[PDB]
Design a protein around this ligand. Structure first.
Ligand SMILES: CC(=O)N1CC[C@@H](Oc2cccc3c2/C(=C/c2ccc4[nH]cnc4c2)C(=O)N3)C1
Ligand SMILES: CC(=O)N1CC[C@@H](Oc2cccc3c2/C(=C/c2ccc4[nH]cnc4c2)C(=O)N3)C1
Ligand SMILES: CC(=O)N1CC[C@@H](Oc2cccc3c2/C(=C/c2ccc4[nH]cnc4c2)C(=O)N3)C1
Ligand SMILES: CC(=O)N1CC[C@@H](Oc2cccc3c2/C(=C/c2ccc4[nH]cnc4c2)C(=O)N3)C1
Ligand SMILES: CC(=O)N1CC[C@@H](Oc2cccc3c2/C(=C/c2ccc4[nH]cnc4c2)C(=O)N3)C1
Ligand SMILES: CC(=O)N1CC[C@@H](Oc2cccc3c2/C(=C/c2ccc4[nH]cnc4c2)C(=O)N3)C1
Lengths: 323, 323, 323, 323, 323
């Protein structure tokens, strides 16, 4: 158990400049996101459905066609549920799997099982297709900058499956994808041949996106081992603003407002947190008004707020990686 | 059973008049403390390190040298960890071991474990060297009125070991010391020969200090079985200020604000709280900015604040103990 | 990682010579042990009642009066049961506490509780009065041979409390005493100051006696890590017979029969097995006839078999201890 | 607490003389059982199937036509399974339910789910349709005597649903009906209005029949708390053969041989045994050659064996109840 | 669900003729085993020792040079131990991975970690160096016959790691390598693409070889869904004797004898058994004399007992696989 797993604790960012930041804002397109990356996912897609495979497919296509060398794996597994053994599949996409340290972005790509009602279907526009698209669009924008990876640090995306409960929310029935992936990663030497260090050691920070796409989001600072990273998002939000690069956005309505949170949301991060992974949980409090209703559709998304979180996060992420 | 162990539920304090308030203030020296109590604790001191031992025996010499008849104990023990079985030594110092009831104050004397970075070392000034000292200095400062214990009630201190995770925070890898001492008290009869009542029945209240020493702390009222004692820590801070006995202090920066908390903090009280001991958790929210970084050093400690908290705590203990 | 613990897997007895075997046979007096070692125990002695103390006392009075330097310990403690919390008191007797390693002979000194039926009172002469006696006597016998101890190893007795169950044999309501103590020793550095060796690594072997004193008994060989000590006991029952020291004893009616068993029996050894100590369980299969019936008394004990084990024992010991 | 829950270990059988033993043998018809109680049960009857329903009703019509005052009780419940929730229905037949104590005879009436193989259906003839019919036959053979039940003791028959696994014998896929009903009685005050005693304290003994029907069975002795009672079946087996009342039976090929066993057999007793119930577990070791094969049909039964066991059992039972 | 998971209750062997039974017995070489399959492996090889790697290296090399199209999987995982986190590596040799069902043979290729005592090093000869060799020979003896495999069924060999506890046998310390793969398998759908079936379904029977090399072993029949398959061992044994193709072989001391065991030995099957797999636990009972003692070496092995089992075994496998 060397010392590299503690570098995370001293990692510091490579702050960008007004000129770079300008380049970053102009290099992301919320409309190409909307059509190419997000509209394909707005379909029923609970675990094991045909939706799950169409969306699982859409995702890999969008990643497969970019220049950076993304090592997609599919992590199909079996688990009991209240309706019996079902088959889930997580999507992991790694740059430099051999890099010892990674920064991770993660969301969930299942949609909650619901029966149809008045012939509408639940599709989870904010829970969590926008997150999925955000991530996909971030690899698409930052592609040329992400070739530069050929500090030992790289980037992983993760699209978890079975996040949502099948029937009735509880530890036995939720977060099926993650730990799984947690427990699996916890028990896989890293780097290879390592002897005491798991892939979780190498997880520098896990940025979980969830419930994004409604208007007027407020993200809290949930955890102390990541507060400094949360503060970098505050600073980025503020700068992109002062340079004029955010859209319909005022500071009296920031997204990253410093406000500690009492309790804990259960979400895919809990399997990695209770293994001492640092988590930046970008889930808003309060949830959207359209949470878990058939109105979590596209009509009710805010394109401005997503373009904005996209700029911020893209920036966050290149400064993390010293790119 | 008996009726003695509900007495905690009715205990009123013996409130001090202005004139004693001024003596108590006069009577604690933050400069003494800093030099004689705290500075020696500012070393790398994790469980089973030499620092640990250094730190451990020092505590005891500061209690040994006082005139009150404190009864040290080293409850040394062994426990499994992510790096093997290791050894841990609590420290307990009681007045009147047979006194049925006891006001207990506690903190933690270990330091998290960190590799050395840029030749820098983690010493944990807030976490929890200062609270260790504050407790020493309380007993120095109060020695003479404590001697008055030759309501069957006396005073206990506890310096827990192993609070901190070795690798990654988790109910398996944390709170070693208290989880041990909690079970061991749940399992010890008291007073000797009683047949249905344990030491934990005679913890009237557990006052736990943690992460104290930084500028501008704010302490929530975490529990309701202990709220009314928080209200007393509030009426004490008030009156000591309204009398010009606090330094660099304004009421628009109170330490104890009547804000309740949502979630919960894992700390060395958990094992006593889910066993029905009342807790006054004096941990601030938010945490110090320097928490679990190398900057948690002496340079970054607010001496004015600590001195102010020394006075509040010393008053509290006396009005509880009817001294 | 020193290696003191593995010595127990290399330890070979100082097999005795027939001459010696005679003496030992002549040294134990089934009518003294009946006289005083045991008839005091034949009382109603469930944990907590008057009987329990008396018996506790009796046990001590009798070890105290032997010239070997026996260190006694009461380990009183509290635990939850189906009638509430109640108080229990183990009994540990050691020579050379420091004697890093140890051979341990355990039995249980309580009596199951029962109401008074017909006007009869349970007493558990086989469960486990006799095993107690048999250990006392073993002391009173080999006394002079023990004194030798001022490879380093010595002999500890143990007389667990509340093995029996207050209501329903259920893991929650049984073995109060061993369950406790195995946790306790499983967390106690041994020797003083060790950093990774608990008092259980110091148990070379545990010999537990239970349900002894009824006629024609058989003792299976349940545990591989301890056969070889079983074997030693076949031989020590063999030789001693073929030399006529054994009264009323035929080799078709052996005690230590070739006869592996399959399942486990739940007894005070479970706490110490789980954690990986070696055990020689001398409980018979099947149980005595009078089992948990008011007929478990003296009436029904066969003076001859007892003495005839009481002897195979006192040997086996001495052969363990190279004495 | 009260004293009556302890009656079960002092309770003695009223032995039957040579003439009463005839009157029991002469009192059951293996052919009336075969045709009227057992052939109706030789259908596919996994839980929820149409056979489960047909069986339930047969068992209740057979018991309804008897003169004695049976109380039937369909305790229908829901429980997770490897295919989702499925309903199960246990059948409980009870004499004098106020009666505080009860000897309890039980089997299972489901069949294991299989998929047709060779155009063959599993009907489980030993597993356990024959035990079911044994209990209806006794109910009949012994009616007039049971009708005497207008010590405080009576009898109950219990037919479990879903004993067997749906997919893989595993703690969570098995014993659906007895894990349930155990748990239920464990928490039903009995007698009514009581305050510390559960229906399970009323279980004097649980005689569980299972896997009966093949030829040449050997039943081992499983539980020291019931060996006295397994001895009483050995005796009955002996006497009935001494008197000529058993057919095709050699004291060589006895059924109740006193060869104790080692490990446990998972079956509808586990739920009741681990909650401290005394159990007589009539299940052969080894298991019929035809076990969980399609060949476990009526062709490979043995009429003489069942009739011989029918006569033992009825006798034991009657002796238990003093009739 | 499908039907093939059931195909295992219905499988029967392709029994061999006396003429064929002769070829096999000649087709094995007990010597070109010893010098080329077994000697390489008698080395300190506790998990992670440079022996482990050699062993793992050796095994692979040997299977690799065979004609059959075996697919080796090294499944290196990480797990917690009483010395911290160590890196295990299971060996998984398979024919026709797709082969939905598989008959599996398995042993454990680790050696228990012992210090060095009087300069002697524990190589475990019967535990389980020999087993692996048996398995390796077996695939060198039948290689030609296995090629036949390009009813849907083939062969898999599993050499576990980490069977042996590191300190003191216990749930948490033991079977590192099979606990882990059992679960890895219970959650991998099989065959690819499946929706509700786990690679453990595809496990027809697990034959576990453990503790094989002493003279005069007595293998009991532990489990009944395998008993039928145990009886195929008796009949092969018997038969190969009636033509004395064996050696030093009696019938007064055959290996597989009609003597059920009581309970269970903990070994690498538990993890599979408790998910309802079928096990042929070819572990003798009682264990060898040289068990967990430094004399489990090449000098207390019985060349002849092994060449025989090697023949019994090898046959059985052809009869299972209709070759
Ligand atoms: C304030 C808040 O929002 N939360 C939720 C997370 C939890 O704290 C942690 C989160 C991540 C890593 C952590 C800890 C944590 C908690 C903690 C609590 C008390 C402490 N006293 C001294 N160091 C101490 C450390 C620790 O040791 N490592 C409290
Ligand atoms: C507004 C707020 O602050 N909170 C705390 C957690 C959450 O808890 C719930 C409470 C009751 C029923 C629930 C859930 C809940 C939580 C949840 C958390 C994260 C999610 N991401 C996508 N769907 C997700 C669902 C869920 O699915 N069903 C609400
Ligand atoms: C509001 C809040 O912030 N919290 C956190 C602590 C928790 O409550 C307790 C803390 C300490 C001792 C306690 C209880 C507590 C809680 C409780 C909750 C609901 C109740 N309804 C009626 N009595 C009731 C009692 C209780 O009974 N004993 C509620
Ligand atoms: C399958 C098997 O081998 N066993 C052991 C006996 C039986 O255990 C019981 C079952 C039901 C009620 C029981 C007990 C039981 C066992 C027991 C074990 C050790 C004892 N030492 C002294 N009395 C003692 C009593 C007891 O006290 N009450 C299961
Ligand atoms: C050590 C020993 O004697 N054992 C091991 C467990 C036990 O039985 C099994 C072993 C492996 C798989 C099994 C079952 C098993 C047992 C069982 C017991 C009672 C039954 N009554 C009807 N079908 C019934 C099925 C079952 O369904 N699947 C025998
Ligand atoms: C089945 C049973 O009743 N028992 C009682 C003792 C226990 O065996 C042990 C006791 C102490 C330390 C031990 C082991 C033990 C047992 C065991 C079982 C299978 C084995 N195969 C190879 N070594 C193997 C070792 C082991 O590996 N380390 C087995």
């Amino acid at each position: 158990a060397s010392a590299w797993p503690e570098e995370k604790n001293y990692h510091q960012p490579a702050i960008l400049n007004s000129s770079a930041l300008r380049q970053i804002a102009e290099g992301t397109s919320i409309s190409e996101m909307w059509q190419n990356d997000l509209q394909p996912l707005l379909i029923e897609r609970y675990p094991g459905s045909p939706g799950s495979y169409a969306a699982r497919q859409h995702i890999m296509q969008r990643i497969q066609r970019l220049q950076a060398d993304w090592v997609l794996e599919i992590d199909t597994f079996l688990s009991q549920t209240p309706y019996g053994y079902r088959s889930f599949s997580n999507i992991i996409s790694t740059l430099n799997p051999t890099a010892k340290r990674h920064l991770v972005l993660a969301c969930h790509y299942d949609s909650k099982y619901f029966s149809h009602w008045n012939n509408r279907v639940f599709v989870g526009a904010t829970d969590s297709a926008v997150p999925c698209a955000m991530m996909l669009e971030l690899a698409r924008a930052l592609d040329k900058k992400l070739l530069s990876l050929k500090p030992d640090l790289s980037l992983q995306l993760i699209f978890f499956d079975g996040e949502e409960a099948f029937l009735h929310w509880s530890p036995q029935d939720s977060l099926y994808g993650s730990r799984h992936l947690a427990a699996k990663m916890a028990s896989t030497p890293h780097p290879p041949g390592a002897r005491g260090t798991s892939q979780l050691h190498g997880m520098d920070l896990l940025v979980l996106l969830d419930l994004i796409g409604a208007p007027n989001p407020t993200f809290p600072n949930f955890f102390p081992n990541s507060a400094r990273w949360f503060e970098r998002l505050q600073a980025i939000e503020h700068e992109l603003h002062e340079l004029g690069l955010l859209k319909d956005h005022s500071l009296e309505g920031r997204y990253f407002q410093n406000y500690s949170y009492g309790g804990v949301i259960q979400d895919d991060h809990i399997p990695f947190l209770r293994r001492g992974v640092p988590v930046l949980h970008l889930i808003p409090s309060p949830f959207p008004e359209v949470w878990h209703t058939m109105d979590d559709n596209e009509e009710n998304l805010d394109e401005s707020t997503i373009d904005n979180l996209n700029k911020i996060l893209q920036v966050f992420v290149l400064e993390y990686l010293h790119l």
